[PDB]
Structure formats: structure tokens, C-alpha cells
Amino acid sequence: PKGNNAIPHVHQKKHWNPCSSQKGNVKVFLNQPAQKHRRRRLRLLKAKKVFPRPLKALRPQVNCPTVRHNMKRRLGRGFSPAELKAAGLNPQYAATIGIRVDSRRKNKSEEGMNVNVQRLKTYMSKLVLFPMAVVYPSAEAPRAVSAEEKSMCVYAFLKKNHSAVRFFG
């Protein structure tokens, strides 16, 4: 006598279960620790083989795209040719001395370009050639309220700026 339950939507009406007549469609994770062990062993072997070069190549710092992740930074794919030129490097030479290059990126503002040029210069200083984290802006220190800030409200400014675009045109 169905009482007061939710209305179910369990979505299991195809032949996913393997039986005497069906092959099934399932995926289990019983090899998870074995595969983790294998991956670690491979990484250790590769580091040993490529010694003394670092195992992971150098990458830039980028900003995350949308308005939800505006304030975060991560590693990118490669350095842009503008940054390489500003650091005084050839792309084809950088690829050999261990720097990742990406000719699709754009460099639309000067701050990100400055950050990446600094990364390149630090690496070039620390590199030795054999013969043949991400950075966040600093927090603001305590201060005091000004006369204008006490006097006027920001809600009216926000609302008028919104109304301009909302009813413009």
C-alpha cells in the first residue's frame, strides 16, 4: 500500500545485468590498488632513467575562466611566444632545454605576461647545461574608514549601473 514515499526514478530498465542470456554493461574497480602500485613503479623507473633531468617539465600560470573561478590560478599548457620573446628565448630551443610551449595562448593583459616572464627568468637562472607553485595576490592589511565611505552608500551606485545596461537601447 504505497504510503508517503518519493516518486522513484531509478533508471535501470536496460540489459545491464549479466545473466545467462546477456553479456551486461558494468564496470568494477577491483584492480584499483594494483593499478596504483603499477603507476608509482613506472614513475620511479622513468625518473631513474631520465636523471638528472626533472621528471615534469616547466609550465606557466593561468587564470581559471568563468565568473565562478575568476579568483583562482592553476598551471597552463605552455608558454606563449610573446613571453618567450620577452625572456629572450627561441621556441625550438626552449623545447629542447625543457620548457613547454603553446602557440595558441593569447596574452591579453600585462600582469599575466609579467608573471610568466618572471617564471622563465628564474628557471633560466637555475638551469645548468651539460656539454655535448602558483602565486596569489597578497591580502589587504587593516585600515580605517574614510569620510566618503562613511557618508555615501554603494547600493545606489550599483543599482544605477545595473539600470543603465538593463534599460539602455
Partner 1 sequence: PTRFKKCRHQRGSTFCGYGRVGKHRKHESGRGNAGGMHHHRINFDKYHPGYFGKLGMDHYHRKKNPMWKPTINLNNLSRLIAAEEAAKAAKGGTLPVVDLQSSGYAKLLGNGHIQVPCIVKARYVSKLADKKIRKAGGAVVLQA
Contact with Mg ion (CB under 5 A): which of 1, 3, 131, 137?
Answer: 1
Is the CB of residue 133 less than 8 Å from the CB of residue 111? no
Site string for RNA, 30-69 (x = CB under 7 A): xxxxxxx-xxxxxxx-x--xxxxx--xx------xxx-xx
Is the CB of residue 120 less than 8 Å from the CB of residue 87? yes
User: Residue type for 49, please?
Assistant: K
Q: How many CA atoms lie within 13 A of 96 on its CB side?
A: 6
Q: Which stretch binds partner 1 (CB under 8 A): 31-39, 87-95, 120-128, 134-142?
A: 134-142
Contact status: 150 vs RNA (CB under 7 A): no
Contact status: 7 vs partner 1 (CB under 8 A): yes
Identify what 141 binds: RNA, partner 1, Mg ion, none; CB under 5 to 8 Å per kind: partner 1
Quickly tell me which residue has 609579467 as its cell.
114
Q: Which residues are annotated as a binding site for Mg(2+)?
A: 132
Identify what 60 binds: RNA, Mg ion, partner 1, none; CB under 5 to 8 Å per kind: none
Identify what 165 binds: partner 1, Mg ion, RNA, none; CB under 5 to 8 Å per kind: RNA
User: Residue type for 32, please?
Assistant: Q
Distance CA 6, CA 24 (A): 29
Shortest gap between Cβ of 152 and RNA (angstroms)? 10
Contact status: 150 vs partner 1 (CB under 8 A): yes
Rg, C-alpha atoms of the chain:
28
Residues 6+ apart with CB under 8 A from 43: 55
The residues that touch Mg ion, with contacts defined as CB under 5 A, are 1
